[PDB]
Ligand binder design. Structure first.
Ligand SMILES: [Co+2]
Ligand SMILES: [Mg+2]
Length: 235
């Protein structure tokens, strides 16, 4: 996929500002989650507690973000930005506010009552693709990845899909091979793709669906988006 260069260019201009409104809604959603960390039993409950108007506003801000700035895969891809020179130059300075925008796109995806969490899937895979650097922040991404896998295949209204489709449908890349072209060291070195294809195969075969509790899921998501937020991804 090609990120519209004009729209991405607009994002450079409105970056710090959209980032600010973004961190507003994060602090809200996160504060509201702090009150009810045991009554929020599922995304739908997260929704009711937030309020329709808060929710409606949440989706409208995400809509403008998505349409105006060309984010076809719903969020920001640091692997993509690091890979393609034109985008690197455009964004190399703006890593801090980019992390904020992505956080927002991650957090509100917790509201997806289909449990597909396409945006969280994107963010986790992007993290997995980005890391060459020595980190155990990787480990956390693998774990969160297995949870998203449970959440997807544990919901019986979600169609059976291959590991390939599960991975690529949320990435601005066209094939599994292509991922080898844009990834960091860890992806190739630890044969990460095979681990994911394995995990995905076993989770949809297993009668055990040891899904985590939502408030624990949410807390792990918030935690993970926070670690990400103090990591230097752009080279
Ligand atoms: Co588990
Ligand atoms: Mg794709």
């Amino acid at each position: 996929s090609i990120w519209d260069i004009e729209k991405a260019s607009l994002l450079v201009n409105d970056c710090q500002n959209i980032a600010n409104m973004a961190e507003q809604k994060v602090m809200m959603v996160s504060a509201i989650f702090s009150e009810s960390s045991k009554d929020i039993v599922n995304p739908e409950s997260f929704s009711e507690r937030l309020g329709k108007e808060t929710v409606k506003d949440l989706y409208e801000f995400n809509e403008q973000l998505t349409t105006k700035y060309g984010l076809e895969f719903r969020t920001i891809f640091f692997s993509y930005i690091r890979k393609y020179d034109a985008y690197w130059c455009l964004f190399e300075d703006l890593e801090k506010p980019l992390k904020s925008i992505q956080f927002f796109t991650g957090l509100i995806d917790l509201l997806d009552n289909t449990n597909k969490h396409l945006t969280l899937r994107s963010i986790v895979l992007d993290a997995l693709l980005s890391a060459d650097e020595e980190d155990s922040f990787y480990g956390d991404a693998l774990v969160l990845f297995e949870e998203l896998v449970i959440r997807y295949f544990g919901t019986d209204s979600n169609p059976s899909i291959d590991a390939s489709e599960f991975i690529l449908s949320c990435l601005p890349y066209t094939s599994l091979d292509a991922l080898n072209v844009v990834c960091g060291q860890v992806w190739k070195s630890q044969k990460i793709c095979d681990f994911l294809k394995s995990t995905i195969g076993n989770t949809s075969n297993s009668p055990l669906q040891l899904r985590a509790s939502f408030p624990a899921f949410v807390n792990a998501v918030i935690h993970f988006l926070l670690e990400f937020k103090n990591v230097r991804r752009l080279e």
